[PDB]
Amino acid sequence: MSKFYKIWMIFDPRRVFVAQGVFLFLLAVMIHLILLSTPSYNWLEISAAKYNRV
Amino acid sequence: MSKFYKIWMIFDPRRVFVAQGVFLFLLAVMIHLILLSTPSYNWLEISAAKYNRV
Amino acid sequence: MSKFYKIWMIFDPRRVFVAQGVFLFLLAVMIHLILLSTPSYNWLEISAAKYNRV
Amino acid sequence: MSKFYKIWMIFDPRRVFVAQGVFLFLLAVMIHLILLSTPSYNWLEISAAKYNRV
Amino acid sequence: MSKFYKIWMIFDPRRVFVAQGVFLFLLAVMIHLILLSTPSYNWLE
Amino acid sequence: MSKFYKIWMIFDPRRVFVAQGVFLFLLAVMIHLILLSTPSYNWLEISAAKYNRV
Amino acid sequence: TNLRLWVAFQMMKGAGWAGGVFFGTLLLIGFFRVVGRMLPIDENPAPAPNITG
Amino acid sequence: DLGYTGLTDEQAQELHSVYMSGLWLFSAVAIVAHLAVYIWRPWF
Amino acid sequence: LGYTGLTDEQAQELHSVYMSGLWLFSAVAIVAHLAVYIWRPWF
Amino acid sequence: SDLGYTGLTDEQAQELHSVYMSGLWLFSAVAIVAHLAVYIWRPWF
Amino acid sequence: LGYTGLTDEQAQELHSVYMSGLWLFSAVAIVAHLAVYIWRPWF
Amino acid sequence: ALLSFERKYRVPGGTLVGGNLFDFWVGPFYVGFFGVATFFFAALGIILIAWSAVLQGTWNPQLISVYPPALEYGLGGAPLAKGGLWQIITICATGAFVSWALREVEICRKLGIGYHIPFAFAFAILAYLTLVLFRPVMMGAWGYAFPYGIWTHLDWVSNTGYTYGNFHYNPAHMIAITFFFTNALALALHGALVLSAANPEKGKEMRTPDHEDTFFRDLVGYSIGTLGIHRLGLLLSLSAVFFSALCMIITGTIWFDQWVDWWQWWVKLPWWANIPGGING
Amino acid sequence: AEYQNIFTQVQVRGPADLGMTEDVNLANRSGVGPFSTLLGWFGNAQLGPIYLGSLGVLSLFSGLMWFFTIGIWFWYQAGWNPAVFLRDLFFFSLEPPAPEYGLSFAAPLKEGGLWLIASFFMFVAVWSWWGRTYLRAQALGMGKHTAWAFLSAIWLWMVLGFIRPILMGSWSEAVPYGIFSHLDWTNNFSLVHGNLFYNPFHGLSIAFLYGSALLFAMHGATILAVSRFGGERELEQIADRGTAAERAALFWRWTMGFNATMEGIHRWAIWMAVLVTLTGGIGILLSGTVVDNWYVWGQNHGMAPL
Amino acid sequence: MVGVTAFGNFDLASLAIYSFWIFLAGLIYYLQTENMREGYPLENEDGTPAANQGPFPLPKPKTFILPHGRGTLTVPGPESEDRPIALARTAVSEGFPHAPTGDPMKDGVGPASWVARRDLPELDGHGHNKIKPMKAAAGFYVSAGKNPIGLPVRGCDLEIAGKVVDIWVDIPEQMARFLEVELKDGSTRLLPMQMVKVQSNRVHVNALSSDLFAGIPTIKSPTEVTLLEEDKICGYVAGGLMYAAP
Ligand code: BCL
Ligand SMILES: CC[C@H]1c2cc3[nH]c4c(c3C)C(=O)[C@H](C(=O)OC)c4c3nc(cc4[nH]c(cc(n2)[C@@H]1C)c(C(C)=O)c4C)[C@@H](C)[C@@H]3CCC(=O)OC/C=C(\C)CCC[C@H](C)CCC[C@H](C)CCCC(C)C
Ligand SMILES: COC(C)(C)C/C=C/C(C)=C/C=C/C(C)=C/C=C/C(C)=C/C=C/C=C(C)/C=C/C=C(\C)CC/C=C(\C)CCC=C(C)C
Ligand SMILES: COC(C)(C)C/C=C/C(C)=C/C=C/C(C)=C/C=C/C(C)=C/C=C/C=C(C)/C=C/C=C(\C)CC/C=C(\C)CCC=C(C)C
Ligand SMILES: COC(C)(C)C/C=C/C(C)=C/C=C/C(C)=C/C=C/C(C)=C/C=C/C=C(C)/C=C/C=C(\C)CC/C=C(\C)CCC=C(C)C
Ligand SMILES: COC(C)(C)C/C=C/C(C)=C/C=C/C(C)=C/C=C/C(C)=C/C=C/C=C(C)/C=C/C=C(\C)CC/C=C(\C)CCC=C(C)C
Ligand SMILES: COC(C)(C)C/C=C/C(C)=C/C=C/C(C)=C/C=C/C(C)=C/C=C\C=C(C)\C=C\C=C(/C)CC/C=C(\C)CCC=C(C)C
Ligand SMILES: CCCCCCCCCCCCO[C@@H]1O[C@H](CO)[C@@H](O[C@H]2O[C@H](CO)[C@@H](O)[C@H](O)[C@H]2O)[C@H](O)[C@H]1O
Ligand SMILES: CCCCCCCCCCCCO[C@@H]1O[C@H](CO)[C@@H](O[C@H]2O[C@H](CO)[C@@H](O)[C@H](O)[C@H]2O)[C@H](O)[C@H]1O
Ligand SMILES: CCCCCCCCCCCC[N+](C)(C)[O-]
Ligand SMILES: [Fe+3]
């Protein structure tokens, strides 16, 4: 752990950051769309079914 | 955290802004589309329901 | 906020203006088409029903 | 707008006037076709029905 | 308004007129086909 | 295991870690999906049934 | 009055090609139209491939 | 001035004068044609 | 500045003619819209 | 080179930006009136 | 390291303008979210 | 924004129409006389497809379809909502393709190269014109052309194919399918062979076209050569499309029944039609 | 008239090219065969020599047994009549065992037993040829792109005949050995799984079969267009870029707005062709195992009205 | 396992179709950046680097070793059109043509362009010359087709410009490369075979007219042609279709 900083002497920083940035975005979109496809956690329809919107 | 300014010494400013502007617009378009899909947040037909335009 | 003019020291105005004109016109068409898509806001059908021209 | 004339110190008139010519004719045919498709504003059939030609 | 003649100092007259003949004929063909399609103005019948 | 450290003389650290990074994520995602597929271990359907969210 | 005839011939040259190409296609359409009516079609009318719309 | 295509200032005026005269005369024939159709079968 | 080579006095003369054609174009369209709104209003 | 990729100097960018925002404010002002007219005609809220 | 070519003070200035616009964009979105939440809350 | 070697190639000339009226580049694209035509036709057809979507009532791109006019309209015009929009988009697509092919000819002249590319693109155009224009004109109605939808133009293919049974039995179909499979096989071999020569094993000298001939002689005993493989690749694809358009210009105009029954002319040849045994005897 | 460089107007012939011996076992390589004038009008005229080593013997003899096994079954199916064999050649078929046996090997030789024997010969012949394709490149110190591109086509071949029938639990799912027979199998495979057109990977697989046809027509026409500048020798254009590569790139730069290099276009070519069978293998492997109706699955995934 | 979905309608077929979109996006990034190894970075209309370089970053250098001790080529690297481009821009703005400042064919611009390549012959795997005249190559003969030796060479102006002396052949490929044509001046020029049309009684060159053969670039050795000479000869002849057919 004390010597984790060596990771940036193995890999290009420019390629790591783009690789991680795309990964983090797609993962968050995947999890958000997983909850939207579950009616138990679809925050849009939960409010609709709670405030009697329909 | 103060040294976040040094991301500009790593990434070319030109490609970042083109990538970011596309990302923001496509994201904003996507979120506006998800609301339009739900009948409970489709602000166009909420007004039709409210003002009896059908 | 008072130093936004330096965007022109990064992007060429000729390519920025061309992209902006394409983007704004396509966005204008997309929003106008979306309204015609909805029955509640189709200004052609609204006047047809209002003035009894069906 | 007292200095909008500077746009011609950015864009060559030969390429602008050609581009604007295609846009204005594309926009004109686009709208004249939109009215023809809608039965409310199809002036070719409004005359046909008005004079009992069918 | 009185200076529209300077359009011929920008574009080539010998090439504009050739293209303008193409545009005016294709526009004419377009309208006749639309008229020919409508039952009321179909004159070939 | 005293001389395990000489594995790196044989393989590039760059090629190993990318291969390990892709492998671990694909294994992890697959197992999470296998659990969601089974109704007995879908932690989102369990919670809905526990809290009467359907 | 050479310039008046010059501009007219430049435009008539443009419109001649548009007409020549256009009426060239009508012959091609007219060709398949004639070959269509000399074949046993209209006695074996195929069904509609797509819903009428 | 600009001389993008290489025509003098007094050359463009003479060419435009000929071009515009044909344009109006062409529109006169078109209005006659449109007026004939409107009498026969008006579209308004 | 000056990507096309036209000077200030040339840009203003170029823009003077362009806006004249623009106001001419819009004036015809304004009348055309007024006539159509008389014949069949869309509001 | 953040000191200018496009060859514009500092003062030229300021001049170009002032003209650009003037068009932006004019274009947005038309849209504000257009939305104000549509909202009075047929509000979406 | 520095792969682009920007000196340290240029990175300071480029970030200062970028973050100034970053707050402006997020400021408008905060007001939009606060306005939409009052009109029709999603919680 | 030019390639490092592009300055000496941007010269005025080689324009079929105009010469300086539309002789310039917008970015990397060459705006010819037909570049203006291609853009107008490409742009109008796209927005009509967008407009046809609002008439259809959908925004899912995979559900948007523009249908041809119904079979009751024959070969004439149609209302815009029914099939008139299809006829405009078909005209717009036909104009855009021919302008794109004609615009490529101006680029060939300005670079001084052969006209193989525009000629090969016209084969695609002729196959397309066969399906929407030539074949429907023969059959008699515009309703036999395929619709302009991502998944509904597949329904036209499936429905048209099963009108004649299994379409695999069309003899010109079998020839065309053979050319398509050979073209993709040769493309894999051609890309792999050149890449292996340019990228040898490791720390090795770049190989030579003498290694390219030797590899395929060791493998399959023959090598068509570096010039032969490019002639073959062009001819396999042009042949694949030629027999593609051939198999559909004869379907429903000359052949009307099941394509399986065609192959009974061979199995009923007089000298072996009555020999007992086998599958058909 | 103008020369389009589609046929060689003049042929020149010299000593027979025996190839280069980088690491090749020169014993296994045969002698140069004949010269074809007819093939010389289009490409090279020289036939051979061919390398037939250890994997060549295994592949050619196994491929012979696969071919000869199907032939003898066709002679049996013809009643040993040379005329009937000729008549019904496209109708004969060697079929896999009936679905009652599942994956078991206890089916009679006339009811899917010879199919298993012929299939084993094909399994050995095709896979040995991939090894030969790999080893022939290695002896010349060349890259393995041919071997790995071939592995993409073997993938669809193994999905059709081996992998999917194992996953479906019966050899009856596999492809019969015949001309009209395997066309019926293809037609019936779609009907059983509900309009295979709506399989997303069949749709993608077709996108790359048309893309390969599009790409080779483009690339083949481009090279013949710039062949006047010595453009056919793509290998020496990569080492020292010439006016052929610059005109070829600038054509597609001015046309499409983007272009390729002389070497990078062959990465498009190899990747476009391998996706034809790489994607096709997944779509075939997903049919019946995961989806048993592609039109109904499509309806739930856009792609089709409800 | 038909109908098994982890969530919503996301079954194993959805995982496959969505995994391919990600793989295809990565492949298109790779295929495009591997095609930025020549002609980059982008220049302005005068020579300076452009302010726009595109969404795709440049790839990392790769070294090509050359098969006969000809050196190491690393791409992408420093680039320069090592020659005097003789062009003057027709407009101050960008995107407009460049007019030649003189004779275009001699100056080497437009469709008559050439690239300054390595000024050495191309070598086969044995190290010999890939192209050499047929009378120097041993055992090479005209196996089929009209032997185009001794036929007059007619230009695009339907006037005779010489007669064919020899054929330059590609030794390993075994195909004809050039026709060596002797002029009335007594000298010899090379004409690429792709640019000639060998008829029954003559060779017709549609590109050049009669009074341009004397302007074809010559070769420094009677039995050896280099890549620089090939590019000048091929570029000059094919440039006559535009600048030499008036
Ligand atoms: C009615 C029938 C269905 C249909 C049913 C199927 C089925 C079933 C399949 C396809 C498959 C495909 N379909 Mg389909 N398909 C339909 C409609 C179409 C249409 C169209 C215009 O309508 C087109 C263009 C296609 C095209 C395609 C291809 C994209 C794909 C085949 C790839 C391939 O090359 O495999 C051919 C290549 C191989 C099989 C690999 C062979 C390599 C082996 C290893 C070599 C062995 C050599 C052998 C031993 C011989 C040796 C000889 C000596 C060496 C000389 N289909 C309709 C809807 N289609 C295939 C696929 O994978 O798609 C998902 C497939 O399985
Ligand atoms: C003939 C051999 C093969 C071939 C060759 C070929 N194609 C070519 C060329 C060549 C030589 C080009 O030079 C040209 C090119 O520049 O390619 C990059 C091209 C081209 N082939 C293309 C596509 C293409 N080729 C196909 C096939 C083939 N092309 C053959 C198999 C297919 C198939 C099988 O589906 C497609 C989709 C383009 C990438 C390009 C031509 C681009 C073009 O025409 O540009 C101008 C037009 C537009 C920008 C779009 C206009 C849109 C319309 C106005 C509206 C939509 C109409 C359309 C019919 C709707 C379809 C709906 C549904 C069916 C999806
Ligand atoms: C389907 O499967 C489900 C979803 C159900 C479950 C699966 C779950 C899985 C597989 C989860 C996996 C999760 C993982 C691996 C998460 C990893 C997250 C990580 C590693 C996040 C890291 C984030 C790092 C960030 C955000 C760092 C940002 C850094 C900056 C913003 C500063 C930029 C750096 C600079 C400026 C350095 C400059 C310095 C110099 C000297 C130039
Ligand atoms: C599907 O979801 C929907 C669409 C419903 C909702 C989503 C909506 C979204 C994502 C909307 C996004 C909207 C955005 C980002 C809009 C942005 C609009 C902008 C930036 C408009 C700006 C316009 C500015 C203009 C038109 C300025 C023009 C300026 C001029 C004409 C001045 C000319 C400039 C000169 C002459 C330069 C000076 C030159 C010299 C030499 C000094
Ligand atoms: C689906 O959505 C629908 C289509 C229903 C609604 C959407 C509507 C949309 C998006 C509409 C967009 C409309 C726009 C942006 C319209 C803009 C129109 C403009 C800017 C028109 C401008 C016209 C200007 C003209 C015609 C100017 C002509 C100028 C001349 C003839 C001057 C000639 C120039 C000369 C002689 C050069 C002088 C040279 C010297 C040296 C003095
Ligand atoms: C599909 O959508 C529809 C069609 C339904 C609606 C769309 C309509 C649209 C967008 C229409 C667009 C119309 C436009 C822009 C029309 C513009 C027409 C113009 C500018 C016509 C100009 C013509 C000028 C001409 C013909 C000038 C000719 C001049 C000469 C030939 C000079 C010499 C001739 C003389 C002096 C006349 C006497 C000479 C002889 C030899 C008798
Ligand atoms: C007069 O003619 C003579 C007798 C001299 C020779 C004539 C021969 C003839 C007429 C040959 C005809 C051959 C034909 C028509 C061949 C057609 C072959 C076709 C269409 C094949 C198509 C697909 C085949 C596939 C996909 C086979 C796949 C097989 C595998 C992937 C491996 C199979 C291995 C299995 C199933 C398990 C084997 C393992 C054990 C332990 C038995
Ligand atoms: C390029 C490929 C696509 C090309 C598309 C071309 C479409 C444009 C067609 C133009 C020609 C139209 O041709 C015309 O069509 C109309 C359509 O009502 C037909 O009109 C016919 O049907 C109408 C239906 O109410 C009746 O009045 C009557 O039966 C008859 O007039 C005419 O018989 C025909 O002459
Ligand atoms: C572009 C490449 C990157 C893609 C995005 C990165 C994440 C990849 C995995 C995304 C998985 C989620 O994808 C999402 O899945 C749910 C699961 O039913 C789908 O399903 C949802 O909509 C469909 C269609 O209206 C309904 O039939 C269904 O009832 C509903 O649950 C969504 O239509 C899809 O958008
Ligand atoms: C004011 C009347 C104008 C009449 C001329 C209109 C253009 C005529 C073009 C003739 C073309 C004839 N053709 C057969 C070549 O198409
Ligand atoms: Fe190639």
Coordinates of N, CA and C in Angstrom, one line a residue, chain M residues 1 3 5 9-15 17 20 37 41 44 200-201 204 208 227-229 232-233 236-243 246-247 253 258 260-261 263-265 267-268 271 275 279 286 288-292 297 300-301, chain N residues 1-2 9 11 13-14 16-17 20 27 30-31 35 38-40 42 62 64 73 79 111 113 115 117-118 122 125 131 138-146 169 173-175 177 193-198 227 230-231 234 238 241:
Chain M
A1 N -9.5 2.7 -77.1 CA -10.1 2.5 -75.8 C -9.1 2.6 -74.7
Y3 N -7.4 1.4 -71.1 CA -7.0 0.1 -70.4 C -7.4 0.3 -68.9
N5 N -7.0 -2.3 -66.6 CA -6.2 -3.1 -65.8 C -7.0 -4.3 -65.1
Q9 N -2.8 -7.7 -70.6 CA -2.8 -7.8 -72.1 C -1.6 -8.5 -72.6
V10 N -0.5 -8.5 -71.8 CA 0.7 -9.2 -72.2 C 1.2 -10.0 -71.0
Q11 N 1.6 -11.3 -71.3 CA 2.1 -12.2 -70.3 C 3.6 -12.4 -70.5
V12 N 4.3 -12.4 -69.4 CA 5.8 -12.6 -69.4 C 6.1 -13.8 -68.5
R13 N 6.8 -14.8 -69.0 CA 7.1 -16.0 -68.2 C 8.6 -16.3 -68.2
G14 N 9.1 -16.7 -67.1 CA 10.5 -17.0 -67.0 C 10.7 -18.3 -66.2
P15 N 11.8 -18.3 -65.4 CA 12.0 -19.5 -64.5 C 11.0 -19.6 -63.5
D17 N 9.3 -20.0 -60.0 CA 9.6 -19.4 -58.7 C 9.4 -20.5 -57.7
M20 N 10.9 -19.0 -51.1 CA 12.0 -18.7 -50.2 C 12.0 -19.6 -49.0
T37 N -2.0 -20.7 -69.0 CA -2.2 -19.4 -69.7 C -3.5 -18.8 -69.4
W41 N -4.2 -14.8 -67.6 CA -4.9 -13.6 -68.1 C -5.5 -12.8 -66.9
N44 N -1.4 -14.9 -61.5 CA -0.2 -15.7 -61.7 C -0.5 -16.9 -62.5
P200 N -30.6 -10.5 -33.4 CA -29.7 -9.4 -33.5 C -28.4 -9.7 -34.1
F201 N -27.9 -10.9 -33.8 CA -26.6 -11.3 -34.3 C -26.6 -11.8 -35.8
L204 N -26.5 -8.5 -37.4 CA -25.1 -8.0 -37.4 C -24.2 -8.8 -38.4
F208 N -21.9 -7.4 -41.8 CA -20.5 -7.6 -42.1 C -20.3 -8.5 -43.4
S227 N -3.3 1.7 -59.5 CA -2.3 0.7 -59.9 C -1.3 1.3 -60.9
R228 N -1.7 2.4 -61.6 CA -0.8 3.1 -62.5 C 0.3 3.7 -61.8
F229 N 0.3 4.0 -60.5 CA 1.3 4.6 -59.8 C 2.1 3.5 -59.0
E232 N -0.4 -1.6 -56.6 CA -0.7 -3.0 -56.3 C 0.3 -3.5 -55.3
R233 N 1.5 -3.1 -55.3 CA 2.5 -3.6 -54.4 C 2.3 -2.8 -53.1
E236 N 5.4 -2.6 -50.3 CA 6.4 -1.5 -50.5 C 5.8 -0.1 -50.3
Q237 N 4.5 0.1 -50.4 CA 3.9 1.3 -50.1 C 4.0 1.6 -48.6
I238 N 3.8 0.5 -47.8 CA 3.9 0.7 -46.3 C 5.3 1.1 -45.9
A239 N 6.3 0.5 -46.5 CA 7.7 0.9 -46.2 C 8.1 2.3 -46.6
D240 N 7.7 2.6 -47.8 CA 8.0 3.9 -48.4 C 6.8 4.5 -49.1
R241 N 6.1 5.3 -48.5 CA 4.8 5.8 -49.0 C 5.1 6.6 -50.3
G242 N 4.2 6.2 -51.3 CA 4.4 6.8 -52.6 C 3.1 7.6 -53.1
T243 N 3.1 8.0 -54.3 CA 1.9 8.8 -54.8 C 0.7 8.0 -54.9
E246 N -1.0 8.1 -51.5 CA -1.5 9.4 -51.2 C -2.7 9.7 -52.0
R247 N -2.8 9.3 -53.2 CA -4.0 9.5 -54.0 C -5.1 8.6 -53.6
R253 N -10.6 10.6 -48.4 CA -10.6 11.7 -47.6 C -11.6 12.8 -48.1
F258 N -13.0 10.9 -44.1 CA -11.9 10.1 -43.4 C -11.4 9.1 -44.3
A260 N -7.9 5.9 -44.7 CA -7.1 4.9 -44.1 C -5.7 4.9 -44.6
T261 N -4.8 4.2 -44.1 CA -3.5 4.0 -44.6 C -3.4 2.8 -45.5
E263 N -1.6 0.2 -44.9 CA -1.6 -1.0 -43.9 C -2.9 -1.1 -43.1
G264 N -3.4 0.1 -42.7 CA -4.6 0.1 -41.9 C -5.9 -0.4 -42.6
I265 N -5.9 -0.3 -43.9 CA -7.1 -0.8 -44.7 C -7.2 -2.3 -44.6
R267 N -6.5 -3.9 -41.9 CA -7.0 -4.2 -40.6 C -8.5 -4.1 -40.6
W268 N -9.1 -3.1 -41.4 CA -10.5 -3.1 -41.6 C -10.9 -4.4 -42.4
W271 N -10.8 -7.5 -40.0 CA -11.8 -7.4 -38.9 C -13.2 -7.4 -39.4
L275 N -15.8 -10.9 -38.4 CA -17.1 -10.6 -37.6 C -18.3 -11.3 -38.3
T279 N -19.8 -13.2 -35.2 CA -21.1 -12.8 -34.8 C -22.1 -13.9 -35.1
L286 N -27.2 -18.9 -29.7 CA -28.3 -18.3 -28.8 C -29.7 -18.8 -29.3
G288 N -32.6 -21.3 -29.7 CA -33.0 -22.5 -29.1 C -32.5 -22.7 -27.7
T289 N -31.2 -22.4 -27.5 CA -30.6 -22.5 -26.2 C -31.1 -21.3 -25.3
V290 N -31.2 -20.1 -25.8 CA -31.6 -19.0 -25.0 C -32.9 -18.4 -25.5
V291 N -33.1 -18.3 -26.9 CA -34.3 -17.8 -27.5 C -34.8 -18.9 -28.4
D292 N -36.1 -19.2 -28.3 CA -36.8 -20.1 -29.1 C -37.8 -19.5 -30.1
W297 N -39.3 -12.5 -29.2 CA -38.2 -11.8 -28.5 C -38.0 -10.4 -29.1
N300 N -40.5 -7.8 -27.8 CA -40.2 -7.3 -26.4 C -39.0 -6.4 -26.4
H301 N -38.3 -6.2 -27.5 CA -37.1 -5.4 -27.5 C -37.1 -4.4 -28.6
Chain N
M1 N -32.8 -22.6 -20.9 CA -32.9 -21.4 -20.1 C -33.5 -20.3 -20.9
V2 N -34.6 -20.6 -21.5 CA -35.4 -19.6 -22.3 C -36.2 -18.8 -21.4
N9 N -36.3 -7.2 -19.2 CA -36.2 -8.1 -20.3 C -34.8 -8.5 -20.7
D11 N -32.1 -10.6 -20.8 CA -31.7 -12.0 -20.8 C -30.3 -12.2 -21.3
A13 N -29.4 -13.0 -24.2 CA -29.3 -12.5 -25.5 C -29.1 -10.9 -25.5
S14 N -29.6 -10.3 -24.4 CA -29.4 -8.9 -24.3 C -28.0 -8.6 -23.8
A16 N -25.5 -10.3 -24.6 CA -24.6 -10.5 -25.7 C -24.7 -9.4 -26.7
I17 N -25.9 -8.8 -27.0 CA -26.0 -7.7 -27.9 C -25.4 -6.4 -27.3
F20 N -21.5 -6.6 -27.4 CA -21.0 -6.4 -28.7 C -20.9 -4.9 -29.0
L27 N -13.3 -1.6 -30.9 CA -12.6 -1.9 -32.2 C -12.6 -0.8 -33.1
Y30 N -9.8 1.4 -32.1 CA -8.5 0.8 -32.5 C -8.2 0.9 -34.0
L31 N -9.2 0.6 -34.8 CA -9.0 0.5 -36.2 C -8.8 2.0 -36.7
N35 N -5.0 3.9 -38.2 CA -5.0 4.6 -39.5 C -4.6 6.0 -39.4
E38 N -0.1 7.8 -40.8 CA 0.5 8.5 -42.0 C -0.4 9.8 -42.2
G39 N 0.3 10.9 -42.5 CA -0.4 12.1 -42.8 C -0.8 13.0 -41.6
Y40 N -0.4 12.7 -40.4 CA -0.7 13.4 -39.2 C 0.5 13.9 -38.5
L42 N -2.4 17.2 -38.6 CA -3.0 18.0 -39.7 C -2.3 19.4 -39.7
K62 N 5.3 2.7 -33.9 CA 5.8 1.3 -34.2 C 6.9 1.4 -35.2
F64 N 9.1 -0.4 -38.1 CA 9.1 -1.4 -39.2 C 10.6 -1.6 -39.6
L73 N 11.8 2.2 -40.2 CA 10.7 3.2 -40.4 C 9.8 3.2 -39.1
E79 N 7.3 14.4 -40.6 CA 7.0 14.3 -42.0 C 7.2 15.6 -42.7
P111 N -2.6 16.4 -60.4 CA -2.6 15.0 -60.9 C -1.3 14.5 -61.4
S113 N 1.6 14.8 -59.7 CA 2.4 14.8 -58.6 C 3.3 13.6 -58.4
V115 N 6.1 11.7 -55.3 CA 6.6 11.7 -53.9 C 8.0 11.4 -53.8
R117 N 10.6 9.5 -52.7 CA 10.8 8.2 -52.1 C 12.3 7.9 -51.9
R118 N 12.6 6.7 -51.5 CA 14.0 6.3 -51.4 C 14.5 6.1 -52.8
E122 N 13.8 -1.3 -55.9 CA 13.1 -2.2 -55.1 C 13.7 -3.6 -55.2
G125 N 13.2 -10.9 -52.4 CA 13.7 -11.6 -51.2 C 15.1 -12.1 -51.3
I131 N 12.6 -5.1 -60.6 CA 12.3 -4.7 -62.0 C 13.6 -4.6 -62.7
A138 N 17.0 -13.4 -67.4 CA 17.3 -14.6 -68.2 C 16.1 -15.6 -68.2
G139 N 15.8 -16.1 -69.3 CA 14.7 -17.0 -69.5 C 13.3 -16.4 -69.6
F140 N 13.2 -15.1 -69.6 CA 11.9 -14.5 -69.6 C 11.5 -14.2 -71.1
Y141 N 10.3 -14.7 -71.4 CA 9.7 -14.5 -72.8 C 8.3 -14.1 -72.7
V142 N 7.7 -13.7 -73.8 CA 6.3 -13.3 -73.9 C 5.5 -14.6 -74.1
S143 N 4.9 -15.1 -73.0 CA 4.2 -16.4 -73.1 C 2.8 -16.3 -73.9
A144 N 2.2 -15.2 -73.7 CA 0.9 -15.0 -74.4 C 0.6 -13.5 -74.6
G145 N -0.3 -13.2 -75.5 CA -0.6 -11.9 -75.9 C 0.3 -11.3 -77.0
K146 N -0.2 -10.2 -77.6 CA 0.6 -9.6 -78.7 C 1.9 -9.1 -78.1
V169 N 10.2 -6.0 -66.8 CA 9.4 -7.1 -66.1 C 9.6 -7.1 -64.6
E173 N 7.1 -11.3 -59.4 CA 5.7 -11.3 -59.7 C 5.5 -11.9 -61.1
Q174 N 6.4 -11.8 -62.0 CA 6.3 -12.3 -63.4 C 5.2 -11.6 -64.1
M175 N 5.2 -10.2 -64.1 CA 4.3 -9.4 -64.9 C 5.0 -8.2 -65.4
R177 N 5.9 -4.5 -66.3 CA 5.8 -3.3 -65.6 C 5.8 -2.1 -66.5
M193 N 2.8 0.0 -67.8 CA 1.9 -0.8 -68.6 C 0.5 -0.5 -68.4
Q194 N 0.1 -0.1 -67.1 CA -1.3 0.2 -66.9 C -1.8 1.4 -67.7
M195 N -0.9 2.2 -68.2 CA -1.3 3.4 -68.9 C -1.3 3.2 -70.4
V196 N -0.9 2.1 -70.9 CA -0.8 1.8 -72.3 C -2.0 0.9 -72.7
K197 N -2.3 0.9 -74.0 CA -3.3 0.1 -74.6 C -2.7 -0.6 -75.8
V198 N -2.3 -1.9 -75.7 CA -1.6 -2.6 -76.8 C -2.7 -3.2 -77.7
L227 N 12.7 3.7 -56.9 CA 11.4 4.1 -56.5 C 11.1 5.6 -56.8
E230 N 10.4 5.8 -60.5 CA 9.1 5.2 -60.8 C 8.0 6.2 -60.5
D231 N 8.1 6.9 -59.3 CA 7.1 7.8 -58.9 C 7.0 9.0 -59.8
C234 N 5.5 7.6 -63.3 CA 4.1 7.2 -63.2 C 3.3 8.5 -62.9
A238 N 0.4 9.9 -65.9 CA -1.0 10.0 -65.5 C -1.4 11.4 -65.2
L241 N -3.6 13.3 -68.3 CA -5.0 13.2 -68.5 C -5.7 14.5 -68.2

